[PDB]
Design a protein around this nucleic acid. Structure first.
Ligand code: CA
Ligand code: CA
Lengths: 149, 151
DNA sequence: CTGCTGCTC
DNA sequence: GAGCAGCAG
């Protein structure tokens, strides 16, 4: 039962920082960011045997056992949207395939592997943020060029 | 004494996080499923300095004050990552706020630093990132010593 | 297609 | 200074 947290005030509800501390100390998350993103890296890495890369700098986040760079999610439990995080400098082929995963605010729902190419045919560019934007909705979910896990 | 947490596994911990977020949202502390710090800051600044929020956080402003001015609200939790690089002012050239307020937290969501930094003083120390098409500012050194910035 | 928030090396 | 993540309308 999660109804005991009505007793804690706004300051005490400090506990979320503590949970991040625990997850960090367990290896689940590296950064103090949105916990969904690092948990995605964590699950994908351990599952199919991937060495993570702390330097996601304009590049992938992991390498498979065949030496291929992998870019690693979105948690749609209050507003259903599946736009993936921004992709910058994509014209340079900085990854060999991408793994995108949906969580339920944090259980797994969907998960896909997409070559850098399929992205091109499912991406639009925004000058405002200087990034190609993609949404994991509908079409791309049915390209046989994409695989699901 | 948060030693009882170790009894929870990963999925239950993540559930507890999101659930805690849903509490503060139900209390009106936050408006999104993003980082509780930013909306908690926005919540903190307005309900303490008499301001009015704008969920239409698009003009680059996040609230109007008692005097009737636009204010951009940006927060950050530095824990000795001690970098104090603020969020993108993706559009600042249009100048859709009068004075910016940046608030600095520690791990336990406590106020280490807070400044009311005005717009032209933001113009005097800003740098533009070609990568993200946005201006970036840091609050360390010359910015703090500027006579046009207060706490 | 328009926007946001915070965080790391 | 370069980079990063997820999230809202
Ligand atoms: Ca990633
Ligand atoms: Ca803000």
């Amino acid at each position: 039962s999660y109804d005991w947290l009505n007793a804690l005030n706004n300051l005490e509800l400090s506990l979320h920082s503590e949970i991040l501390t625990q997850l960090r100390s367990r290896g689940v998350i590296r950064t103090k960011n949105n916990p969904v993103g690092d948990y995605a890296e964590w699950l994908v890495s351990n599952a199919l045997g991937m060495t993570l890369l702390s330097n996601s700098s304009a590049g992938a986040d992991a390498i498979d056992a065949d030496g291929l760079k992998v870019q690693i999610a979105r948690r749609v439990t209050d507003n259903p949207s599946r736009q993936l995080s921004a992709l910058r400098n994509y014209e340079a082929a900085d990854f060999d395939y991408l793994i995108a995963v949906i969580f339920d605010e944090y259980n797994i729902l969907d998960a896909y592997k997409i070559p850098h190419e399929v992205i091109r045919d499912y991406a639009r560019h925004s000058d405002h943020v200087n990034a190609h934007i993609v949404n994991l909705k509908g079409a791309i979910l049915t390209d046989p060029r994409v695989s699901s896990i």
